[PDB]
């Protein structure tokens, strides 16, 4: 859809917006020398943030097409747009071989 790319655009904003406090709240919990009173109130600040901030909510879709399945991260393309753009000599250094 087009309305479905648009709702997973703003997830990428809200993850990259906060992005620093959640490093600190997970720095407090991960220490064995940390006190649980400093841990328990640190648990409060995680769950009162909106949940669309973790990377697990983020879903790497194809950038030109939007199809979820068949994505590679050494490119930005889908499974079936990568073929049509490679036969036209665009992708540099890419050939067939055996």
């Amino acid at each position: 859809k087009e309305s479905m790319k648009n709702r997973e655009l703003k997830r990428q904003l809200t993850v990259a917006k906060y992005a620093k406090k959640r490093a600190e709240l997970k720095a407090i919990i991960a220490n064995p020398n940390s006190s649980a009173e400093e841990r328990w109130n640190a648990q409060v600040a995680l769950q009162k943030q909106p949940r669309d901030a973790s990377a697990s909510r983020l879903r790497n879709r194809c950038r030109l097409t939007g199809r979820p399945h068949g994505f590679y991260r050494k490119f930005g393309l889908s499974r079936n747009k990568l073929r049509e753009a490679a036969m036209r000599g665009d992708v540099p250094g890419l050939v067939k071989a055996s």
Binding site: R63, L64, R73, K74, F75, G76, L77, A85, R88, G89, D90, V91, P92, G93
Partner: peptide, 25 residues
């Protein structure tokens, strides 16, 4: 024949030059 676009890129910027060069055309 040869490619229509020649440029070397690292593995951290390879997919940030393709998305430029595909919405230029």
């Amino acid at each position: 024949k040869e490619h229509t676009s020649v440029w070397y890129a690292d593995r951290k910027n390879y997919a940030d030059y393709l998305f430029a060069d595909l919405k230029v055309r």
